[PDB]
Design a protein around this ligand. Structure first.
Ligand code: SAH
Length: 738
């Protein structure tokens, strides 16, 4: 009764499926599969479904506890099966368990290193886990050298017990240990960071006096974790705005619990007022008419200038597209002594304070650029000014709501400063002349005029071509652009047009209707197509009738610089909903790129060996999380050396299916001798065969991307290389051959 008496579990699991019961079905399928390897492929997909829905049931009951073990059993049943590994990793990633799905993606890649989707998902998980700026920090030789010198000077002064807050890779704890610290303790909130910090400390042979903890500093207890109050506290929990990573609260906790009567010792914040057209394009709507659509003055847009995410942006002002003008002189904003618990407490209960700065160059007030000097001690200090090429960035406070932004010689800039929520907040920015929440990409979209001009022209062309008078009931226009878009309002002016906007914000819909009224629109015209209860994007149907669409504005390019996923599938869906003459915008897309030499991209993607880290071996452990593509790039101010001519890497036709090829190859003319390190790329969107939008143009809101290489390639002027390009459904892969 071992062979026959089995699949009664299967016949009961069918009944359980009929009753929406997945636990009994999962257990029955476990019984059937673990007793019959012959059925592993017969009920593969049904078991997959059963386990997915049972895991959803378990997550609804807050039973991750056993959900992870259930997924582990599912793996145990199927050994080398990269398909199940990948699919289950995506299901774990979807439920919010990235720290756990990372291992499943790693195993899926280990079973087949050529699995496309496995690697393309592992890169997502690694980008979410390890943060990019870490790579820029470990490669800062100046930062590492100065921190090592300061920690050594502190240890030689009598500090034998050192605690590292925000240890990350544990390189600061290793600096302390190598300097001769007796007791070294480190803490890091991230699971993955603790994970590879263990590896780094072990391989560098320092697990003796370095005790690692997986917790925030605010969770440390004495003597439960560390046995005593330490004599030294090191940390690098600082950002562009210093307080952005919460050093104040952590150091208040450290002085109140874990310290004897701190590196860094102090900080002096400096600021300046800058003119910059790019910052203005990203954080201020300059134009008041958008291709014939008048924006009313009572509807004022703003960027995330908050009043709880950062109320400022971060920019590398040392390489801003175009440049920047210093309208004033570098002036002090505040000073923080990290060896002052009184001041650290008073900053929370501190009221704002005003500062006035004179103008030295007449221009346009566009932003407030803020950096700081981190005083490790009386000797060592690290600056983050744009004149210094370090790893850090500069904080940028935008300037909203002023009658005139022109400042002259003799005027001042008056501003309040406050650190009331441990976040550097500069407010009340005004100029005494001497006697909607749109994102940065949305602001730059409104500021981008050629986009709207070309869209209006192509829309008018197609609409007039579809009207019966020239073809020999109003026309329907669909806009599925992700975010704010005035394209439906533009289309509404071109005759009997029914525009549909997929914008999902209530605020944005109200604003679009107010703008329509400002343009004397019948309010019934602009209909908002936010249709769903829980759908990712506005899934594509026809209107209330099957009267097929005339114009469908798809979203093809992600503002990160990559091609937006499910593009060809959504285009194939949309092609069936067009009438005999309809159009999908864009009509096609040409992906262009070139080969360059950039040390900047190399050091942005991965760590450059023990050179930068001063002997300590950290690159092999952290470069496991390096990704092949840099996103959100401005090729306008990219520090590199071009090595070839820009060529077409890909074509993507959205009206024609059978065109968009797969494994294409391109021959590239190497027109300069050097070292290929990366492949930047951008796009040209052809709406009409005449009209073209250049995503690399300095008026575009989009960003460019770049495939960064692991090992730089040596080439000479006159050589010709080959590039293999794959458009795998929702991803683009660019590999090289000599
Ligand atoms: N109070 C705290 N306790 C533990 N980790 C913290 C923390 N505050 C911030 N962090 C984390 O520490 C990380 C900083 S890494 C900064 C230092 C760098 N890893 C080095 O040793 O050279 C951030 O990812 C942040 O999330």
């Amino acid at each position: 009764m071992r062979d026959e008496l089995v699949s009664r579990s299967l016949q009961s699991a069918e009944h359980c499926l009929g009753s929406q019961d997945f636990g009994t079905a999962y257990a029955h399928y476990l019984l059937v599969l673990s007793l019959a390897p012959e059925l592993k492929d017969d009920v593969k997909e049904t078991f997959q479904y059963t386990l997915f829905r049972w895991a959803e049931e378990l997550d609804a009951l807050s039973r991750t506890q056993d959900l992870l073990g259930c997924y582990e059993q599912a793996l145990e049943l199927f050994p080398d099966d990269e398909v199940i590994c990948n699919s289950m990793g995506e299901h774990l990633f979807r439920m919010g368990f990235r720290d756990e799905a990372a291992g499943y993606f790693h195993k899926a890649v280990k079973l087949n290193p050529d699995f496309n989707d496995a690697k393309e998902n592992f890169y997502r998980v690694a980008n979410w886990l390890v943060e990019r700026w870490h790579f820029i920090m470990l490669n800062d030789t100046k930062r590492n050298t100065i921190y090592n010198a300061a920690i050594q000077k502190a240890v030689c002064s009598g500090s034998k017990s050192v605690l590292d807050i925000g240890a990350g890779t544990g390189i600061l704890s290793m600096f302390a240990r190598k300097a001769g610290a007796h007791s070294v303790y480190a803490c890091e909130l991230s699971k993955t960071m603790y994970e590879l910090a263990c590896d780094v400390v072990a391989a560098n042979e320092m697990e003796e006096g370095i005790k690692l903890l997986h917790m925030k500093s605010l969770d440390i207890k004495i003597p439960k974790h560390i046995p005593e109050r330490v004599s030294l506290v090191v940390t690098e929990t600082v950002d562009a705005g210093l307080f952005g990573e919460g050093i104040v609260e952590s150091l208040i906790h450290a002085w109140e619990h874990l310290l004897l009567q701190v590196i860094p010792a102090s900080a002096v914040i400096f600021g300046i007022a800058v003119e910059c057209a790019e910052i203005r394009r990203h954080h201020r709507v300059g134009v008041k008419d958008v291709a014939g659509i008048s924006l009313p003055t009572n509807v004022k847009f703003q960027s995330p200038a908050y009043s709880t995410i950062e109320p400022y942006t971060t920019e590398k002002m040392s390489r801003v597209p175009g440049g920047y003008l210093a309208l004033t002189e570098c002036f002090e904003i505040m000073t923080v002594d990290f060896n002052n618990l009184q001041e650290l407490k008073s900053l929370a209960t501190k009221k704002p304070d005003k500062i006035g700065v004179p103008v030295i160059k007449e221009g346009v007030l566009d932003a407030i650029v803020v950096w700081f000097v981190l005083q490790l001690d009386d000797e060592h200090s690290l600056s983050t000014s744009p004149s210094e090429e370090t790893c850090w960035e500069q904080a940028v406070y935008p300037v909203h709501d002023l009658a005139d932004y022109w400042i002259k010689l003799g005027d001042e800039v008056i501003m309040e400063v406050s650190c009331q929520d441990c976040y550097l907040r500069i407010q009340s920015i005004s100029v005494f002349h001497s006697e909607c929440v749109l994102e940065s990409t949305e602001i730059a979209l409104l500021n981008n005029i050629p986009y709207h001009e070309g869209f209006k022209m192509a829309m008018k062309k197609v609409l007039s071509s579809l009207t019966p008078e020239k073809l020999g009931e109003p026309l329907y226009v669909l806009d599925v652009s992700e975010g704010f878009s005035v394209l439906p309002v533009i289309a509404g002016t071109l005759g009997q047009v029914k525009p549909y906007s997929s914008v999902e914000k209530d605020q944005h819909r109200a604003t679009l209707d107010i703008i329509c009224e400002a343009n004397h629109f019948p309010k019934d015209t602009l209909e908002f197509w936010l249709r769903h209860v829980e759908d990712e994007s506005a899934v594509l149907q026809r209107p209330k009738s099957d009267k097929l669409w005339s114009i469908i504005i798809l979203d093809v390019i992600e503002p990160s610089g990559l091609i937006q996923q499910e593009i060809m599938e959504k285009a194939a869906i949309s092609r069936c909903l067009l009438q005999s003459g309809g159009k999908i915008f864009p009509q096609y897309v040409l992906m262009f790129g070139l080969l360059v030499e950039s040390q900047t991209l190399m050091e942005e993607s991965a760590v450059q060996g023990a050179e930068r880290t001063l002997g300590f071996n950290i690159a092999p452990f952290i470069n496991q999380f390096q990704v092949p593509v840099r996103v959100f790039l401005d090729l306008a101010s990219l520090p590199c050396i071009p090595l070839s001519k820009p060529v077409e890497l890909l074509r993507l036709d959205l009206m024609t299916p059978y065109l968009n090829t797969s494994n294409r190859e391109v021959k590239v003319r190497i027109c300069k001798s050097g070292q290929v390190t990366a492949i930047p790329f951008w796009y040209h969107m052809y709406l009409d065969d005449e009209i073209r939008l250049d995503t690399s143009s300095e008026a575009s809101h989009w960003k460019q991307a770049a495939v960064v290489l692991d090992n730089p390639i040596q080439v000479e002027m006159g050589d010709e290389l080959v590039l293999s390009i794959q458009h795998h459904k929702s991803n683009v892969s660019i590999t090289i051959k000599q």
